[PDB]
Amino acid sequence: YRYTGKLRPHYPLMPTRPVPSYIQRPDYADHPLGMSESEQALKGTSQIKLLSSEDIEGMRLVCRLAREVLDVAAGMIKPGVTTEEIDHAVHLACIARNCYPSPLNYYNFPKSCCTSVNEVICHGIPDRRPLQEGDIVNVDITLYRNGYHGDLNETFFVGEVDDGARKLVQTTYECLMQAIDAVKPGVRYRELGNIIQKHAQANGFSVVRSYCGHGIHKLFHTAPNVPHYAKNKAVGVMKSGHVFTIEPMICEGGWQDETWPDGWTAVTRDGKRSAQFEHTLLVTDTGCEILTRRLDSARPHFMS
Numbered sequence: 001y002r003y004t005g006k007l008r009p010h011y012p013l014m015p016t017r018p019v020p021s022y023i024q025r026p027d028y029a030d031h032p033l034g035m036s037e038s039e040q041a042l043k044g045t046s047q048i049k050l051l052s053s054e055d056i057e058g059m060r061l062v063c064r065l066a067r068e069v070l071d072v073a074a075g076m077i078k079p080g081v082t083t084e085e086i087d088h089a090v091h092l093a094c095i096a097r098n099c100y101p102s103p104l105n106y107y108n109f110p111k112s113c114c115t116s117v118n119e120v121i122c123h124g125i126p127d128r129r130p131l132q133e134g135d136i137v138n139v140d141i142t143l144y145r146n147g148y149h150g151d152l153n154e155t156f157f158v159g160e161v162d163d164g165a166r167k168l169v170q171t172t173y174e175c176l177m178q179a180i181d182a183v184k185p186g187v188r189y190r191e192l193g194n195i196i197q198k199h200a201q202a203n204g205f206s207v208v209r210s211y212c213g214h215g216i217h218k219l220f221h222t223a224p225n226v227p228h229y230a231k232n233k234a235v236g237v238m239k240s241g242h243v244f245t246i247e248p249m250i251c252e253g254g255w256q257d258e259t260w261p262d263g264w265t266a267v268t269r270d271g272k273r274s275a276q277f278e279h280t281l282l283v284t285d286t287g288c289e290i291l292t293r294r295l296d297s298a299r300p301h302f303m304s
């Protein structure tokens with residue numbers, strides 16, 4: 001394999017971390033290939049769940065806890081801390097909240113969160129690499145509680161970063177927020193990509209095509225598929241009661257991605273940097289509720 005940039009995996013990985021038996025597990029947790037029965041039963045369907053009040057309560061809870069766990073990771077971002085160390089803290093913080101870390105054994109994903117440094121677009125596997133000053137790093141968190149998943153991510157600066165890094169991270173966040181602002185009943189899912197690409201393209205950045213936002217509730221990933229690029233063929237119309245993510249990945253160079261031999265790590269083909277932000281959203285009559293919002297600060301960590 002020819003690596004596309006400077007990053008390399010840093011092995012070996014510590015043995016899989018156990019989740020105490022008292023924590024409720026998703027179906028895939030014990031499947032040998034980490035396949036999800038309930039997700040496969042819906043493969044290729046485009047119908048979107050309309051959540052009940054019980055569902056919405058369960059989603060509000062798990063999204064709040066997920067935000068708590070992401071803030072835990074945020075507090076650890078400094079030079080010299082390894083992504084494995086972040087994952088360990090994350091793992092323990094999920095368990096302390098009586099939550100299962102959704103990524104763990106999801107299709108055999110080996111860790112409890114995804115850590116995506118620099119040219120890694122998404123699905124970076126926490127490993128022995130210490131973070132370096134100048135790095136940007138996304139941590140993507142998903143928790144499972146009482147049958148519901150809650151999903152968010154932010155990109156962080158490691159010490160002082162260059163102007164390009166600041167512009168990429170700031171722009172990606174703006175893309176996400178401009179998309180969220182358009183969310184309300186009656187809006188087509190395919191419209192969000194028009195908004196995101198319009199802002200990224202205006203700032204000289206490109207929009208990853210191979211990975212999209214997704215429905216999430218009793219399933220980790222489900223309908224609707226939510227592309228982040230312009231003129232896409234996403235199926236469906238927003239309705240009060242829908243829950244889904246918007247999670248744009250934006251790149252310094254071209255949009256093209258490829259996957260490391262580990263089967264997971266998605267990297268830019270040109271080795272240039274990529275950044276990402278994600279919220280889980282509930283569509284309401286007036287617009288939408290940001291279920292994974294920070295509660296005690298107005299801003300994402302990179303600007304606090």
Ligand SMILES: Cc1nc(-c2ccccn2)nc(NCCNc2ccc(C(F)(F)F)cn2)c1Cl
Pocket residue numbers: 039103106107109114123211212213214215221222223224225226
């Ligand atoms: C964004 C994303 N992330 C992961 C993943 C896997 C391991 C760890 C973290 N994330 N896995 C994903 N999908 C796995 C395959 N399953 C599905 C199911 C439904 C859909 C959708 F299109 F949204 F309906 C997409 N993928 C996706 Cl879409």
Ligand SMILES: [Co+2]
Pocket residue numbers: 122123
């Ligand atoms: Co993912």
Ligand SMILES: [Co+2]
Pocket residue numbers: 140141142151152153247278
């Ligand atoms: Co996520």
Ligand SMILES: [Co+2]
Pocket residue numbers: 151152213214245247278
């Ligand atoms: Co997501």
Ligand SMILES: [K+]
Pocket residue numbers: 116117118119120121122136137138273274275276
């Ligand atoms: K990245």
